[PDB]
């Protein structure tokens, strides 16, 4: 729990850096009896704003003392079925670029963003780039002919990969995938990690 | 600052996991313009337990979610003058053991504390343990004679140290010190980090 | 090359502890011809052990010395065509458990090894488990009913997947696939990351 | 031991992408017995271009495939008496600059250089810079006055600092330091880490 985490953590810092609930208090404008309830899981209402103060003069960050992820598996394992996929369609230049079906996550490799995605143009022409992005993605052409374009947008690199090939595109490289010429559509696994 | 921070990060993550204003603001019971909102440096009064939830529907962390400690030095250093040290009596059993003389801390590296420390009894009998912590530590003997204790404080193994002693202890590893027998009292720097 | 990198993080080292060429020299029982020799990429021959004493008497690690897996991209990406992927057919207990075709992998995330997993067996009886590995695995059913095992091998937890159905196994966490009883073969994509 | 971690990191690494001692044999130009010896121990005599190449077939780094700086700690501790430390003079453009006394280090934490260093040069106008290096560096002036100096060489930024300041200076940072004009000599402990 978010109190919970802030609580026992907020203590440690302030052990920490050798402060005591007045020490504290003082530098925050704050009374020690304030101070002594948050480490006590009464902090819940605190606003994002003063989480960033007491960060401040804690000198750390609101992440150092606000808690994990948490626990989202069973018994080491997250499963789901195909049915429950979320499904966002992806929108670029106004036009139906991709549909994005969300396969499982877990709260414990937050980075882990696994995607069936459904190609849905098949004009090289039209291709549209994203900025690249954060995080190493690996991809599989699951269906069709994929035409992937990537780095420099306005003079990239290409490859026409069929069904079956296997790709990995670096952090911060951007790219675009397409079905490959007149094909009308391909999917490809994407996985985000 | 906390809320633009906020407001660039939930972007970020919003994105990752391929959800829009809307299907974010679903899950979480707001409205597309709330979400919106955020995402433009308005979160600043989200409490404590409302980013817990926002980063739960997500997936992830607050931490995640919120910005870096933040810098807060001038042109890659920071000074600070000894009478400018902040000054924290600490107490073991009601005894004033310790008195931490806290140096130069800087945002961008939160895990370091450096300390001037006056072991202030001289009673290896009567020294008191700690549970251990997380961190390293060098020390470093800056006057008279330590006397150290470390592990099972019930059967720690010791050592005297003079004037110019260097030691280092583990995180977790328990540890205790006071001035050489009779002595009554030493000086050393303590450096967490 | 493992000379040249290994020649400048020596160097670095070696500086980083304030040791001059006849200082290192000196701990090692060399001559300072010797180690300037290796900082200029003369080191080419030095055998593990020997490494594993420089290492040593730098208080760290052949890692800290050597460098990193180095870059096999082709400006940003690495791209597989299905039939230059290499098949590793996996046994267990003597029988044909698994057949690996391994996807696309760089050395600039060498704990990325996406796979297309052959379950052989149909037998939920005669499954068997591995004792659990470092890494996260993210899975997906390519094809078939994956009957999926993980936990304690004596009392497991089990899961019947369908076709298009995602997974993940935390790092450690044992488990073991086949395909749903009597339906033959089942197929499905492992992502270590 | 450099062989034994060795062993066994490369069964690891061998297994995680799927191979067996025939299918690494193969890649390497070796026989399946070979291999074999090293995942036993047998691999002290390889040399680091051999090492190299392993690692290159394997798609990572030498340093994977080695084991741990290892462990040199009593219990969570290592102490250093003020009589063993090590003394190297250190010279800029043919002047007694600095003296280094090196302090305590461990296998356990390679980044954490601690040193008492000895200011021998008193004239600001002389004094001379390094290159900014690796890792934050703490310091605490033990003696005299101090006058610092960091950024650009040509135009940087200063400080005096008496007996007792103490600072931080960031990687990669800058940084010269000479003792007060005319007052001799000064000592700082400098801690890296
Ligand atoms: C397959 C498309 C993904 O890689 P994107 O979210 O557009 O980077
Ligand atoms: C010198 C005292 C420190 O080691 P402490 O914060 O009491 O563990
Ligand atoms: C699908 C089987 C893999 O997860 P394994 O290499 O046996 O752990
Ligand atoms: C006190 C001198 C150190 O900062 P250096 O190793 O010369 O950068
Ligand atoms: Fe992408
Ligand atoms: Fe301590
Ligand atoms: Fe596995
Ligand atoms: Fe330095």
Same sequence: chains 1, 2, 3, 4.
Avoid at 171 to 189: D, M, N, Q, R, W
Wanted: net charge negative; hydrophobic share 40%; with cysteine.
């Amino acid at each position: 729990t978010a109190s919970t985490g802030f609580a026992e953590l907020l203590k440690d810092r302030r052990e920490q850096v050798k402060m005591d609930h007045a020490a504290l208090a003082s530098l925050l404008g704050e009374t020690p009896e304030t101070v002594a309830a948050w480490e006590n899981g009464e902090g819940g209402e605190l606003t994002l704003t003063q989480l960033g103060r007491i960060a401040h003069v804690l000198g750390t960050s609101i992440g150092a003392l606000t808690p994990p992820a948490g626990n989202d598996l069973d018994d080491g394992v997250i499963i789901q079925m195909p049915d429950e996929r979320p499904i966002l369609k992806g929108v670029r230049d106004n036009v139906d670029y991709y549909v994005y079906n969300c396969l499982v996550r877990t709260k414990r490799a937050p980075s882990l963003v696994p995607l069936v995605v459904d190609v849905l143009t098949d004009n090289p022409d039209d291709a549209k780039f994203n900025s690249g992005h954060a995080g190493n993605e690996f991809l599989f052409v699951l269906e069709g002919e994929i035409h992937m374009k990537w780095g420099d947008k306005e003079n990239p690199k290409e490859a026409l990969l069929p069904t079956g090939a296997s790709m990995f595109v670096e952090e911060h490289v951007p790219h675009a995938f397409t079905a490959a010429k007149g094909t009308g559509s391909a999917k490809l696994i994407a996985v985000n990690f």
